[PDB]
Design a protein around this ligand. Structure first.
Ligand code: NI
Length: 341
């Protein structure tokens, strides 16, 4: 059964609630983004209205075969009426097509559901600036002060400089980047751009990328692995055994692998700066774990909430243990006392 924190009071709406069968009283199902923990349950046999971004709707149609007549794509930054309720979709700074949803309830209450997001000051100048929000349904993935990580720009600088150095020293080195879902495309696209290569990948992953409206993409990606020196592999194959096996398949074109695993946070964040990151190495194979996050750090989250000043916060992540819930509630109270709302 659907949990309370996926239901929008005063409406017929749910958010990211496709794995519960027919939800009692639900007239429209919203989907914030195309990640499996959120879309779990959708298929060609779904016959209720799904409301989402254009990019998310491309992925539903092409990857899950949802029928077109039930996909309702909405433009961003635009007031729309859904089953008699005004809604706005805003960029979530997560993966491609990911949104936050503003609901303007018939009684005057305004609710923001962040979906999954990486808070940024640029959000303080969207349509959020223009009215008060009463309730916030918050992505609390990294809601603890130990969670610090660098900007995306510093992480990409590190990756480009690392790859360009390695391949310029050894033109027979292959670069490999791990993936298991959409998101974090800048990692492999920025590396291919500095090297003058396309990114090579499976037909299934090329298909997924072609649903994303990324400009000039036919220019950056390919299924011809032989023409590419940046390859994308499943995240599970980014280990010494999996990479040795891949290098065998390349027929003596290459004699070294430099591989990247974009994780979110790992505890080596509490001690080491991005500048100081080193790989794990075995023979002619090196593997870099890089802290490329598409969720808010603790400080970015705190700043957003202290700017927004909601009356009530409903966490959507880490809600299954009493220790996590108590921790989060304690930080929400601190933020409110420090800022004065
Ligand atoms: Ni996500």
């Amino acid at each position: 059964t659907c949990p309370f924190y996926k239901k929008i009071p005063g409406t017929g709406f749910t958010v990211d609630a496709f794995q519960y069968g027919v939800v009692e009283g639900c007239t429209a199902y919203f989907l914030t983004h195309f990640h499996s923990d959120h879309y779990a349950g959708l298929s060609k046999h779904f016959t209720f209205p799904v409301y989402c971004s254009e990019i998310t709707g491309n992925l539903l149609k092409n990857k899950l075969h949802v029928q077109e007549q039930y996909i309702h794509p909405l433009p961003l930054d635009t007031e729309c009426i859904v089953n008699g309720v005004k809604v706005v979709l805003l960029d979530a700074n997560h993966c491609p097509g990911a949104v936050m949803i503003l609901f303007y309830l018939p009684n005057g209450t305004v609710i923001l559901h962040t979906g999954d997001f990486r808070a940024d000051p640029s959000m303080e100048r969207s349509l959020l600036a223009d009215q008060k929000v009463h309730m916030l349904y918050l992505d609390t993935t990294y809601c603890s002060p130990e969670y610090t990580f660098p900007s995306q720009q510093e992480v990409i600088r590190f990756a480009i400089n690392t790859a360009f150095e390695a391949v310029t020293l050894n033109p027979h080195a292959l670069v490999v980047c791990g993936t298991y879902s959409i998101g974090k495309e800048k990692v492999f696209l920025a590396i291919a751009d500095v090297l003058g290569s396309k990114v090579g990948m499976s037909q299934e992953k090329y298909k997924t990328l072609q649903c994303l409206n990324i400009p000039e993409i036919n220019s950056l990606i390919t299924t011809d692995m032989c023409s590419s020196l940046v390859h994308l592999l499943p995240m599970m194959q980014i280990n010494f055994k999996g990479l040795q096996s891949h290098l065998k398949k390349c027929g003596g074109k290459y004699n070294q692998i430099l591989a990247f695993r974009p994780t979110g946070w790992t505890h080596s964040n509490k001690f080491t700066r991005i500048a100081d990151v080193i790989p794990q190495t075995k023979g002619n194979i090196s593997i870099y774990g890089i802290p490329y996050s598409e969720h808010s750090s603790y400080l970015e989250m705190k700043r957003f909430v202290q700017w927004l000043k909601p009356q009530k916060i409903i966490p959507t992540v880490n809600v299954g243990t009493w220790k996590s819930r108590s921790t989060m509630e304690k930080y929400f109270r601190e933020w409110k006392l420090e800022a004065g709302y």
